[PDB]
Amino acid sequence: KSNLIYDKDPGYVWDNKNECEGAAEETYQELNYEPSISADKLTWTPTRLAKTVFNTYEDDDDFNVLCYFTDWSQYDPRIINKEIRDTGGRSADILRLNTPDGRPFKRLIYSFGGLIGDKKYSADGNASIAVRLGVATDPDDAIANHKGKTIPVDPDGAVLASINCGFTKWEAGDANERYNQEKAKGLLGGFRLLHEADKELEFSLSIGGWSMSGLFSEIAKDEILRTNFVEGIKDFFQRFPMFSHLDIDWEYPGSIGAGNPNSPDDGANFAILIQQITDAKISNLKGISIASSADPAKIDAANIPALMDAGVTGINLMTYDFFTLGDGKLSHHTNIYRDPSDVYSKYSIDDAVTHLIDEKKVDPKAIFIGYAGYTRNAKNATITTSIPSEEALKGTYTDANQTLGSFEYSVLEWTDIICHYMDFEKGEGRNGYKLVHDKVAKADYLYSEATKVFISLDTPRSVRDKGRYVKDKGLGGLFIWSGDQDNGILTNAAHEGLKRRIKNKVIDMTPFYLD
């Protein structure tokens, strides 16, 4: 009996039927997923297995909690009938955020807008998307006249869908007809429904992200392309007046990121672009944020000073994915602290924050730090710490190809954690897994002696401590990567770390912190 999870996929009512009761468990059966044994499987667990438990808190202090909401998290072909069970989607309902008497986030960040001409991401540089959305007359025109212009790269998910976007029936209309605020369905229509329920909620577009930063370096160098880019912002902000913020998540100026063109000039060029967007005087655009790596060497390479000199008002510090497979050592993925000589957990929020404030003279209040709705794992792992309960995490792994995850190998998402890996209500691990608190990092991890799988994750305890860090250090606030993953437990912990008075109580968080 649980206030956090369901014991069986409750399904989803669509067109007066519910075709996906138990769908999550049918997938598990088809794939032979067993939590206490599987080291090398995907779960495909839908967020439907979690109960929705966002509290709300007074949020009118000097901090803000932001939410990256991904436009692919709505999908799950299991919803429609009984045909597909060997794979699935996240099925993340935008309506989990529709709380009474407040909001779990001040600002929802649509993730992600792509760029016309981006041939790293798209074989045709998103040209067919441009035509479908009605911003180009044919694919040649898209590239010839609109290179550098932003558009959502998933028009179904952005402006057409009903399921998990707050709408209850299919209606005729193409993406071109629905690519504006009034007519949108999809996640942008879902954002509008939340806008209509809550006038204080803010909306940001994030352009770029890890897979879509391939075109930034080229755009920022070029007058004509920068001008197309600014036009892209004006167009989107005219189509969707409810938007008021822009996150240009170029990952990262001056360094390799996912394999992008890059140049030492990138940060200085990006600053020209920021100024050029400001100069357009888009009446509803109140603020521009950018992304920063947590690696001080990559921070140096980004020329953060140039960007702040051009009037950037926020830095979303991408404090997650610190554990990357490849070097055979375990690591925390989103930890606040580390010992300076640590070769396992090589990065930390604190190292990065300190670097920005002390070396780059960034205003602390501009900085937002991340908490994560997902994990970074390695199978075939060995914990080598001498006293795990008192000492910093150390450990190694051999072959971690095809490690346990939810939708992609090596990454479990939050629903899987609370349903099959950790029982926060009983205060202990599930299915042969044990939770360890690393007091040096102030981060928790999960590990099973039986499966040999190591799982680095955020918990209520660490997210609360991140909220505490933000407050102590006078930072801007926190963001979740990504908010569609959270059932509310993570975000509750953030608000509590900020010392916020509760307004609407759905769940008592007290027993979930475990000291």
Phi, psi of 426 (to 5 degrees): -90, -10
- Is 409 assigned to a binding site? no
Structure tokens of 275? 């100024």
Residue 508, by phi and psi: left (phi above 0), alpha (psi -120 to 50) or beta?
A: beta
154 within 8 A of 72, measured Cβ to Cβ:
yes
Strands 477-481 and 502-504: unpaired
- Give the C-alpha separation, 389 to 106, whole Å: 36
Sign of CA dihedral 435, 440, 443, 446: negative
- Give the C-alpha separation, 327 to 205, whole Å: 35
- Give the C-alpha separation, 380 to 399, whole Å: 6
Q: Which residues pair with 287 in a beta bridge?
A: 245
Structure tokens of 443? 């981060």
Residue 196, by phi and psi: left (phi above 0), alpha (psi -120 to 50) or beta?
A: alpha
Helices 489-497/460-473 angle, 10° precision: 30
The residue with tokens 């992600």 is 112
The 3-state DSSP class for residue 219 equals helix
Instruction: Count the Cβ atoms, other than its own, within 10 Å of residue 427.
Output: 13
What's the length of the chain? 515
Q: Which residues pair with 289 in a beta bridge?
A: 247, 314
- Which of the 8 DSSP states describes residue 156? I
Q: Which residues pair with 69 in a beta bridge?
A: 110
Question: Angle CA(315)–CA(261)–CA(333) in degrees, nearest 5?
Answer: 45
Sign of CA dihedral 40, 45, 50, 52: positive
Instruction: Count the Cβ atoms, other than its own, within 10 Å of residue 80.
Output: 15
15 within 8 A of 452, measured Cβ to Cβ:
no
Residue 496, by phi and psi: left (phi above 0), alpha (psi -120 to 50) or beta?
A: alpha
CA nearest 317: which of 287, 285, 343, 354? 354
Element (H, E) at 274: helix 266-279
Catalytic residue among 202, 218, 251, 413: 251
- Give the C-alpha separation, 306 to 57, whole Å: 36
- Give the C-alpha separation, 35 to 37, whole Å: 6
Helices 266-279/223-239 angle, 10° precision: 50
53 within 8 A of 487, measured Cβ to Cβ:
yes
Question: Angle CA(319)–CA(327)–CA(379) in degrees, nearest 5?
Answer: 85
Instruction: Count the Cβ atoms, other than its own, within 10 Å of residue 116.
Output: 28
- Is 209 assigned to a binding site? yes
460 within 8 A of 486, measured Cβ to Cβ:
no
- Give the C-alpha separation, 284 to 241, whole Å: 7
Biggest alpha carbon–alpha carbon distance for the chain: 65
Structure tokens of 335? 């930890």
Sign of CA dihedral 218, 263, 299, 391: positive
* Method used experimentally: X-ray
- Is 208 assigned to a binding site? yes
Strands 376-378 and 381-383: unpaired
Amino acid at 388: P
Amino acid at 371: Y
Element (H, E) at 131: helix 127-133
- Give the C-alpha separation, 92 to 165, whole Å: 9
138 within 8 A of 219, measured Cβ to Cβ:
no
- Give the C-alpha separation, 295 to 486, whole Å: 26
- Give the C-alpha separation, 305 to 168, whole Å: 48
Domains of the chain and CATH, by start: 1-54+380-457 (3.10.50.10), 55-379+458-515 (3.20.20.80)
Catalytic: 251?
Answer: yes
- Give the C-alpha separation, 318 to 324, whole Å: 14
The residue with tokens 């939590």 is 35
Q: Write the CB contacts of 426 (distance below 8 Å, at least 6 apart in sequence).
A: none
- Which of the 8 DSSP states describes residue 334? S
Strands 443-447 and 434-438: antiparallel
- Is 469 assigned to a binding site? no
- Give the C-alpha separation, 483 to 70, whole Å: 8
- Is 250 assigned to a binding site? no
Instruction: Count the Cβ atoms, other than its own, within 10 Å of residue 258.
Output: 14
- Give the C-alpha separation, 165 to 7, whole Å: 25
Three-state SS for 362-417 is CCHHHEEEEEECECEEECCEEECCCCCCCCCCCEEECCCCCCCECCECCECEHHHH
Phi, psi of 54 (to 5 degrees): -75, 120
- Is 319 assigned to a binding site? yes
Q: Which residues pair with 405 in a beta bridge?
A: 42
- Is 373 assigned to a binding site? no
Phi, psi of 429 (to 5 degrees): -65, 155
Resolution (A): 1.7
Three-state SS for 304-328 is HHHHHHCCCCEEEECCCCCCCCCCC
Distance of CA 259 to the CA centre of its chain: 20
